[model samples]
Each structure stands twice: as C-alpha cells, then as structure tokens.
Target chain A: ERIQALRKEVDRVNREILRLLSERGRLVQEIGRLQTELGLPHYDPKREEEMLAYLTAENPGPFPDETIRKLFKEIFKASLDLEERQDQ
Target chain B: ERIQALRKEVDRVNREILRLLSERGRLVQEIGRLQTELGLPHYDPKREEEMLAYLTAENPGPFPDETIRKLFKEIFKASLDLEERQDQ
Candidate 1:
C-alpha cells in the first residue's frame, strides 16, 4: 500500500492548516483595536482590488482569475463580518 | 470635572474597542482554517474592488470615494494577513 495518498496528505495538511488558522484568529482580534483607534472601517474595497489585481496578474493560472476573485470575495466577507461583530 | 468625564468616556470606548477586536481576531483564525480546507488563497483582489465599488456607488458623499476605499483596503489587508499567518 502507498504510504500516503495525495488525498491523505491534503487532508493532513488541511488539519494542520486549520489549527494554525485558529491561532491567527486571536491575533486578528488585537488588530481590530488598532483599526478602531484609527477610525477605520472593517472593510476596504479599493485596496482589496489592488491586491487581487496584483495577485491575479501574476498568478500562472492553474487557478483561473474568476476563481481567485470568488475565493477572495468570500474571504473578504468573513473578515469584515468579524470586524463588524466587534463594532456591534 | 467635565474634562475628566469626556476623557473617561473616550478611554472607556477605546478599551471596549480593543476588547472586541481581540475577539474578532479569534474568529479570523477559524476562517483561515476554512480557507485552507477549501484550497483558496488568503486573498483575492477582485472581490475587494467589487465591494468598494458597491459601497461607493451607494454612499451619499459625506466621505469621499478615495477615503472610503482607503479605509476598507486596510481592513482587507489586515484580514488577509491573518489568513496568511495561519498558512505559515
């Protein structure tokens, strides 16, 4: 039997990645305060556009630009949601 | 006495802001994990652009488009930073 299937490796990596992501949540909470003090909102569009454009332009495209765009948009929603929660 | 009162309110508000922000950061960590599981990158620029345009088109202009865009952009950056941190 193969020591590890690609699927298994991806699963393992996914678990590890999630664990780290949980830790990052704590850090984002601290950053929220910084944003508030600066009177900044929980989301910013233009900057996001700039970054996405940059990333998409450079991406070699096994992943299409539309896919990249869709993925990031959801991320934007999740993040902004957290920030708004704090405000509320 | 009045000076002390206003200062106290500001400080109180600031403290609350910080506390809430900290909590939000924790949520972000979980989101990062979700992103990983989905095999998406930590960021996407097109989404950001779309959001900014939507916000701007609706805003009545007490704040300029540039200002609003600038603010949300940082929010977007902070969010992506957290997700990236989890990836690392």
Candidate 2:
C-alpha cells in the first residue's frame, strides 16, 4: 500500500512535470521565432548562464547542485532542440 | 516587455519543476530503502515500461513523446543513482 501510494505520487508528479515542460517549450519556441525575426541567435550564453546560476543558488536539495545543474542543462538543451526542429 | 514576461514565467516554471523533482527524488529514495529491506531489485522494467506508456499516452505536445521518453529516462536514472550513492 505504501509503495503503491508513492508510485501514484511519482506518476502525478511526472505528469505535472510533463505539463510544465511542454508549457516551457511553447514559450521558448515563441522566443525562438521572435529572436529569428529580430536577428538574434537561438542560443544565448549569457541568459543560460544566468538561469543556471539562479537555479543552483535556489536549489534546495536531496539532489546536489551539480545534479541540478546537469538536470536543467538537459532540459535547456531539449528546449533548444525543440526550437531548432521547428525552425522550418 | 513581452520577452521579459516570458522569461519570468520560464524562471518560475523551472523552480516549480525543481521542487517537484526534489519531492519525487525523496519518494524514490524511500521506496529504494523499502525495496532493499524487502529484498527486491530497484530496476523494475515492467513498472517503468507501464509508466512510460502512461506518460506517452497522456503527453500533450509541442514537445514530442520521444523527448519525454528521453527526459524522463534521465530523471529515472538520476533517482537510481541517488539511491545507490546513498546506500553506503
């Protein structure tokens, strides 16, 4: 029963995670298009570094700052890939 | 102003995602210990497959199911690693 309950929380958290990621992706894609029209690059190193800094600074963890950094980098890259894939 | 607004939302969403991920990690670590005591393996392919199937089925996209699969696989691995690292 306990394990099942935990599994349900895991499931719920995961679906919510997906929802937020999709929402974030949509926002990034919009920015991507706007940047394209404005003659800006899709990858902004300064902005990404700032974001990473914010995340690590705020990271409250059983997960380490290093883990958070790596995890969010994957997410950041996914957003980048999504924008590029849809660039056509 | 529009870009700034979107960036704020992105920042907010990232924090919430981190919070949920940390919550999820705690749950998995609890399950990990229970499993260890129960003499069970951490890698349950059937459960993982079923969970993935559910996520893909429920996926609402501009982000593709393939991306979700990879992202979540990374998450799953992280949880596993967390447990193993803490085992000692």
Candidate 3:
C-alpha cells in the first residue's frame, strides 16, 4: 500500500513533468517563430551553456548535477527538434 | 529582450522539473525500501503497462503520447537504477 502510494506520487509528478514539457514545447514553437523572424538559429550552444550553469549552480540535489545536465540536454534536444519541425 | 524573457520562463519551468525529479527520486528510494521489506522486485511490467496506459489516456498533447511514453520509460529506468544503488 505504501509502495502504491509512492508510485502514485511518482505518477503525479510525472504528469506535471509531461505538462511542463508540453508547455515548454509550445514555448519552443513560439521561440522558433521569433527566431525565424529574426533570422536566428534554433540551436544555441552558448545559451544552453548558460542554462546548464544556472541549473548546476541552483541545484540542491540528491540527484547529481551531472545527471540533471544530461536530462536537461535531452529536453533541449527535444525542444530543438520540435522547433525544427515547426519550421516546416 | 523578448527572447531573454522566453528563455527565462523556460529556465523557470526547467527548475520546477528538476525539483520534481529530485522529489521523485526520494520517493523512489522510499518505495525501494518498502519493496525490499515486502520482497517485491523493483521492475514491474504489469504495473508499468498500467501506468503507461494511464499516461497516454490522460495525455492532452502538443507533444505526442509516444514521445511521453519514451521519456517516461527513461525515467522509469533511471528510477530503478537509483533504487538499486540505494539498496547497495
């Protein structure tokens, strides 16, 4: 029963993540539109580095900062891919 | 300035995600402890299938359900790995 409750909590958090990621994707599409208007590229390594630094610096973690970086990298890649498709 | 604002919003959401993930990790560890005491295995395909079904059913997506499934699968794998490490 405790395992069920914990798993359910994990599921709730997982849904929030999905919701935020979907919101992020929408923002990525909006950003892609702006980038197109400004003739800017979708992928910006410098900006990503800034994000990584901010994330690592702010991290108070049981999860390693490196793992956070890797997870965020996947999110960034996914956002970029979404942005690229919006261009089509 | 607008781009900067958008990036800031993304960053805020990203932090929320990281925080939630850290919470999830802690919860996973708790669940792992319960599992050990009850002699339950970490990996549960039936439960996983049920969770995936619930996720996809509840999904209202600009992001595809398939993508959500893939991301959740990775999260599941990472959580299980974390649980195993906690057990050791």
Query: Regarding DockQ, does 1 or 2 come out ahead?
Result: 2
DockQ top scorer:
2
Candidate 3 lDDT tens digits, B1-88:
7778887888888888888888888888888888888888888888778878988888776667887787777777777777776742
Evaluated on the second chain alone, the candidates' TM-scores are 0.64, 0.93, 0.91
User: Model 1, range B1-88, lDDT digits (tens) per residue?
Assistant: 4323433443333233333333334444555566687776656577567656665565443334564466456545654656677432
Clashing pairs in 3: none
DockQ of each: 0.03, 0.76, 0.68
Candidate 1, CAPRI quality class derived from DockQ: incorrect
Candidate 1 TM-score to native: 0.42
**lDDT tens string, model 3, A11-81?**
89878888888888787788888888899988899988998998888877656787778778877877777
Output the chain A TM-score of model 2.
0.93
**How close to the true structure is residue A82 of candidate 2, measured as C-alpha lDDT?**
65
TM-score (chain A only) of candidate 3: 0.94
| Models sorted by TM-score, best on top | 2, 3, 1
Report the first chain's TM-score for all candidates.
0.70, 0.93, 0.94
Estimated TM-score for each candidate = 0.42, 0.94, 0.91
lDDT of each residue in B35-88, candidate 2, tens digit only = 888888888878888888988999888878998888888888888887665542
Candidate 2 lDDT tens digits, A1-88: 7778988999998999999988888888887777777777888879889988988999888788888888998999989996666742
DockQ of 3: 0.68
Q: Give candidate 1 misplaced runs (Cα > 4 Å).
A: A1-4, A86-88, B1-88
Compare candidates 1 and 2 on lDDT and give the better one. Answer: 2
